[PDB]
Amino acid sequence: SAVPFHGAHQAGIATPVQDRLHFAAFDVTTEDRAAFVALLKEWTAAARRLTAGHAVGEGAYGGLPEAPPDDTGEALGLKPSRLTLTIGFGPSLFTRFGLADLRPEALADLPKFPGDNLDRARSGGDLCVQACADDPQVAVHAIRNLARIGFGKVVVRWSQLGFGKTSSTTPDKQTPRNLLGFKDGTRNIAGTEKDRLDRFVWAAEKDGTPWMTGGSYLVARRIRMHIETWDRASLQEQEDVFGRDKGEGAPVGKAKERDEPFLKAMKPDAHVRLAHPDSNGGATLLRRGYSFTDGTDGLGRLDAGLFFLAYQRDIRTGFVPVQRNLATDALNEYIQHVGSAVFAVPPGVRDADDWWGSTLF
Amino acid sequence: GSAVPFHGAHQAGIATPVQDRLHFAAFDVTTEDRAAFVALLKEWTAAARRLTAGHAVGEGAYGGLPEAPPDDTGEALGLKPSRLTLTIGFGPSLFTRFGLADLRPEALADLPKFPGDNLDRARSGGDLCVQACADDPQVAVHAIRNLARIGFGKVVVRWSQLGFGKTSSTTPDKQTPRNLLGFKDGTRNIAGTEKDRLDRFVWAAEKDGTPWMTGGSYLVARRIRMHIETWDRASLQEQEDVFGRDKGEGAPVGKAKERDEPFLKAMKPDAHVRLAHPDSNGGATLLRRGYSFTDGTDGLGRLDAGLFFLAYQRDIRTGFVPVQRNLATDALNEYIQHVGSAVFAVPPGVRDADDWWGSTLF
Ligand code: HEM
Ligand code: HEM
């Protein structure tokens, strides 16, 4: 029902994947380092309250009638709902407060990729807060109240709601399906694999940026799907695009979902074949994305897709090589990357006296 | 995660307990052939019988001929019914087609202009709607997508709205949810058990004038933006004064418990509850069934929030209209703006496996 907030790492990376997401990117409006550190301490205090299911500050009610309540109160009577709050720092943060020389080399700018159609307004950001929870209202209340506490020092640049499984009805051992109808997450880094997390996910001291030890690097891509076009493709076209069948999710030529793929039996530009670590010099990612459906655009079409989130030890050796190899993905016919951001996710809050970003500031 | 029965005298999705998630879509008709449109309705009813039971539509999501697109798009495979309901409604503009003019109900009244209205015509109106409600948002999206797919060439989606969480209740024995202003929403609604109150206030009767609508209801949808920056800097007392209930318990002002009956004379003259209460409105009573929404930022550094308000009633002219007219002086108006609007006639229920949506009209 709750996920511990303190740790060597921030929660919400290797911890069990919750049903819902509210991702927000913030821009910083203050030039004052001290004022920003002050806000980081205030946010951390609020995150401790929120992730334990408590109201922020002195509560949603019961205070002085002539003061506004410390907490906006729409999460009253709800449970912690496995809420995790994960903060990250964008490269543009490091142009402020004199931090230019503290930017990790692993926090690399993404190249432009063939087919990119990035909306400037829904890309970038000085920092982000990833709020995951099984109840969407818990997640929204967290973002709503952190933005309020930070008003004057940060504004919300863009925000994305997402959903995965609904746990109260779907088995825990069942792979969820993306909105193309295919199981998603079969061959992924699991939070139980401590050795693969150390190798592929967590920043280490010898990687070159000490304040980032125990952190990770996050890539966010908002990927629209062309739903109506996908849905007119033959069942055989859809399965050819991925290299797995739609019903079971088994790699072509095998019968069970978790059978290891034979890549030579897949089409040369199949998505699994091009994404697999064997085709990328061993490059392996922790995917932790969520589906989205925002409504319908001006042409009647479903505004829906995958809010892709990948964690890795170094952007230069994780996301970049794999996405580069997708240049000829048969999937590119049906998707468009329309938003993008990268963030350095600092190490965990170690105890009650620690705070978000203490190793950097 | 069980199924809600699809057949009945009335459509499910109204007196039914309010499910966690909403996906509501409005459709414009693009065919002149009434025979084709009836065929659509029959095919949509068949799909909905599968969908509400947790089955894939048509011949399924896989296993068919490799070279054909599958009948069902597949993303609900292995999910339970999740209490899915599908409720269809007919807009006033529909009756300009297929020779239906003489059949448009009197109780399908167009809404007048209300003060403060800033309505977007792109997210308003619609020849018909489908309200998909479920506890699993993938289940709801899958149902809308597959209905639209089946209707390609005969209908198109005009506008849609997802509600990420409910702000209404038809089950007073369960916890009342809160809206994004932080107040419980749904305390004094109509309960799906109050059969006599639903007959009097919700279900259309034969005597009312339009025989094909007997057993149906009428739907008012209003998309309402909330000024959360303005709200969130108001004092606790201002917020409580605006509604007439306290924030914590949600009790009428002066009383201890959420479900104690309000004493209206103790509320401000412009309090929302005081002005909305049936006693202030000649007995006018509504079934509220709305959902909260957030659609990103506003581009100005703030979250965008609102309430997708849905009211069912026996007659728009004696339900939503008089109550909304009485909210002209509502203190809540300082914090909200109506920006989308639509009315629909919700026909009677699909009686059995041989019946179909709209059969009593067509
Ligand atoms: C709409 C966008 C995408 C969809 C629908 C999608 C879907 C899938 C599916 C169905 C699988 C097979 C099941 C699984 O192992 O999870 C898969 C595998 C994978 N995908 Fe994607 N994908 C998308 C974009 C991306 C992107 C942008 C990347 C990285 C840049 C990526 C990297 C991977 C990786 C590493 C695997 C595991 C391959 C393996 O080791 O077998 N995917 N994806
Ligand atoms: C964002 C817009 C609105 C918000 C936040 C809101 C909120 C509330 C709240 C907090 C209550 C008290 C608890 C309850 O009994 O449900 C309430 C009651 C009520 N509201 Fe609203 N409301 C909104 C719009 C409307 C509109 C547009 C109407 C009708 C046109 C309406 C009609 C009513 C009615 C009939 C009651 C029950 C009063 C009673 O019988 O005691 N509300 N509303």
Question: What is the per-residue DSSP string for B135-198?
Answer: SSHHHHHHHHHHHHHHHTTTEEEEEEEEESEE---S-TTSPPPB-TTS-B--TTS--TT-HHHH
The neighbour count for residue A66, using CB atoms within 10 Å, is 9
Atom of ligand 1 nearest to the CA of A249: 13
Cα–Cα distance, B76 to B143 (Å, whole number) = 9
Q: Which of B168, B171, B185 to mutate to test the pocket of ligand 2 (most atoms within 8 A of CB)?
A: B185
Nearest-atom number in ligand 2 for the CA of B327 is: 30
Which H or E run includes B353?
Answer: none
Q: Is A359:A346 a contact under the CB 8 Å cutoff?
A: yes
Residues B25, B143: contact at Cβ < 8 Å? Answer: no
Q: Which residue has the tokens 């709305």?
A: B290
Assess contact for B133 and B22: CB atoms under 8 A.
yes
Cα separation of A341 and A130, whole Å?
A: 13
End-to-end CA distance of chain B: 34
C-alpha A80 to ligand 2 mean position (Å): 28
Distances (CA, A) of B53 to B57, B77, B279: 10, 12, 41
In this complex, which of A62, A72, A181 lies closest to B232 when CB atoms are compared?
Answer: A72
Closest partner CB to A74 (pick from B137, B182, B234): B182
Amino acid identity, position A257: E
Q: Indicate the top mutation candidate among B194, B273, B280, B307 to test ligand 2's pocket, ranked by most ligand atoms within 8 A of CB.
A: B273
Q: What is the rounded distance in angstroms from the CA atom of residue A118 to the CA atom of residue A223? A: 10
Rounded distance, CA A180 to CA B181, Å?
36
Give the integer Cα–Cα distance in Å for B263 and B211. 40
* Residues in chain B closer than 8 A to A242 (CB atoms): none
B200: distance to nearest CA of chain A, Å? 33
A334: closest CA of chain B, how far (Å)? 15
Q: Say whether A131 sits in a helix, a strand or coil.
A: strand
Contacts for B260 with CB less than 8 Å, ≥ 6 apart = B251, B252
Block residue for tokens 């997802």: B162
Tell me the C-alpha distance between B276 and B310, whole Å.
15
What is the b/e burial string over B203-232, where b = at least 16 CB atoms within 10 angstroms of the residue's CB?
bbeeeeebebbbbbbbbbbbbbbbebbebb
Two structure tokens written together for B147: 């209905």
Distance from CA of B310 to the nearest CA of A (A): 18
A interface test, pick of B297, B298, B308 with most A CB neighbours within 10 Å? B297
* Residue pointed to by tokens 């007659």: B315
Is the CB of residue B179 less than 8 Å from the CB of residue B171?
Answer: no
What ligand is nearest to the CA atom of residue B330?
Answer: 2
Alpha-carbon distance of B6 to B46, in angstroms, equals: 11
DSSP for A71-83?
S--TTTT---TT-
- Which of B356, B299, B357, B359 is closest to B128 using CA atoms? B357
Domains in chain A, number: 1
Rg (CA), chain A: 21
Helices (H), chain B: 34-52, 137-151, 195-201, 228-232, 236-243, 272-276, 320-326
For residue B323, give how far its alpha carbon lies from the nearest alpha carbon of chain A (Å).
26
CB A19 within 8 A of CB A133: yes
How far is CA B204 from each of CA B11, B295, B321, rounded to the nearest angstrom?
12, 35, 17
Quick one: which H or E segment has residue A40?
helix A33-51
Query: Which of B113, B120, B131, B162 minimizes the C-alpha distance to B340?
Result: B120
List beta partners, residue B310: B221
Per-residue CA distances from A104 to A87, A335, B192, B205 (Å): 16, 31, 59, 71
Ligand 2 pocket at CB < 6 A: B 179, 181, 183-188, 224, 226, 243, 245, 262, 272-273, 276-278, 286, 307, 309, 320, 323-324, 327, 336
Cβ B93 vs Cβ B61: under 8 Å: no
Phi-psi region of A347 (alpha: psi -120 to 50; beta: other; left: phi over 0): beta
Please state, in angstroms and rounded to a whole number, the distance separating the CA atoms of residues A218 and A128. 10
CA–CA gap between residue A307 and residue B344 (Å, rounded): 34
Taking a C-beta distance cutoff of 8 angstroms, is the pair B301, B271 a contact? no
First vs last C-alpha separation in chain A = 33
Picking from B1, B165, B303, the nearest residue to A159 by CB comes out as B303
User: To the nearest 10°, the Cα dihedral for B232, B235, B239, B241?
Assistant: -160
Sequence letter at residue B146:
N
Residues B75, B78, B82, B87: is their CA dihedral positive or negative? Answer: positive
Chain B closest-CA separation from residue A207 CA (Å): 36
HSE (CB half, 13 Å, CA atoms) of B298?
A: 13
Helix (H, G, I), strand (E, B) or coil at A108: coil
CA-to-CA distance for B230 and B246, rounded, in angstroms?
A: 19
Q: How far apart are CA A143 and CA B296, in angstroms?
A: 12
Helix (H) or strand (E) holding A236: helix A235-242
For B184, name the nearest residue in chain A, comparing CA atoms only.
A74
How many other C-beta atoms can be found within 10 angstroms of the C-beta atom of residue A333?
12
Ligand closest to CA A115: 1
Q: Map tokens 């030529």 to a residue.
A: A253
CA distances from B197 to B14, B283, B284, B313 (A): 13, 12, 12, 11
Q: Which are the contacts of B126, defined by CB distance < 8 A and separation ≥ 6?
A: B26, B27, B28, B91, B93, B158, B159, B342, B344
Coil, strand, or helix at residue A303?
strand
Query: Which chain A residues touch B25 with a CB distance below 8 Å?
Result: 296
Nearest 5°: phi and psi at B21? -130, 150
Our CA angle for A143, A147, A150, nearest 5°, is 145
Cβ–Cβ gap B74/A181 under 8 Å: yes
Partner residue facing B237 (CB), from A66, A170, A174 = A66
Domain span at B154:
1-362
Work out the minimum CA distance from A46 to partner chain B, whole angstroms.
Answer: 17
CA nearest neighbour of A280 among A323, A322, A315, A219: A322
> Measuring from each residue's beta carbon to the nearest atom of ligand 1, which residues come in under 6 Å?
A 178, 180, 182-188, 223, 225, 242, 244, 261, 271-272, 275-277, 285, 305-306, 308, 319, 322-323, 326, 335
CA distance A7 to A5: 7
**What is the distance, to the nearest Å, from the Cα of residue A115 to the centroid of all Cα atoms in its chain?**
22
Q: Which residues pair with B89 in a beta bridge?
A: B129
**Interchain contact, A177 vs B149, CB within 8 Å:** no
Cα separation of B202 and B190, whole Å? Answer: 9
* Phi and psi at residue A346, to the nearest 5°: -65, 165
To what resolution in angstroms was this structure determined?
Answer: 1.8
Residues 6+ apart with CB under 8 A from B210: B103, B105, B106, B107, B204
- Residue A197 sits at φ, ψ, to 5 deg, of -65, -45
Q: Which atom of ligand 2 is nearest to the CA of B169?
A: 16
The Å distance, Cα B304 to ligand 1 centre, comes to 31
Closest residue by Cα to residue B167 from B180, B154, B151, B153:
B180
- Please give the Cα distance from A217 to A109 (Å, whole number): 12
DSSP 8-state symbol, A244: B
Tokens linked to B161: 């709205």
Quick count: other Cβ atoms within 10 Å of Cβ A50? 28
Strand pairing class (B291-297; B303-313): antiparallel
Long-range contacts from A196-202, C-beta under 8 angstroms, 24+ separation = A196/A284, A197/A14, A197/A286, A199/A313, A200/A284, A200/A285, A200/A286, A200/A312, A200/A313, A200/A318, A201/A13, A201/A14, A201/A286, A201/A311, A201/A312, A201/A313, A202/A9, A202/A313
| Burial tier of A338 (Cβ tally within 10 Å: 0-12, 13-18, 19+) | middle
Residue having the nearest C-alpha atom to atom 11 of ligand 2: B185
Ligand 1 atom closest to A277 (CA)? 40
Burial label for A48, CB within 10 Å (0-12, 13-18, 19+), is middle
Residue contact A293–B246, C-beta within 8 A: no
The encoded tokens of residue B213 equal 């609508």
Rounded distance between C-alpha atoms, residue B246 and residue A320, angstroms: 53
Contacts of residue A176, Cβ cutoff 8 Å, sequence gap at least 6: A164, A165, A170, A183, A184, A185
Residues of A in contact with B234 (CB under 8 A): 68
The one-letter amino acid at A263: L
DSSP lists the bridge partners of residue A336 as A224
Find tokens 């026996």 and name the residue.
Answer: B314
Question: What's the token pair of residue A12?
Answer: 């919400």
Determine contact, residues A165/A157, Cβ cutoff 8 Å: no
CA B5 to chain centre: 19
Residue in A135, A160, A293 to test binding to B, most B beta-carbons within 10 Å: A293
Q: Which residues contact A78 (CB under 8 A, 6 or more apart)?
A: A53, A135, A137, A138
Of A52, A49, A86, whose CA–CA distance to A357 is shortest?
A86
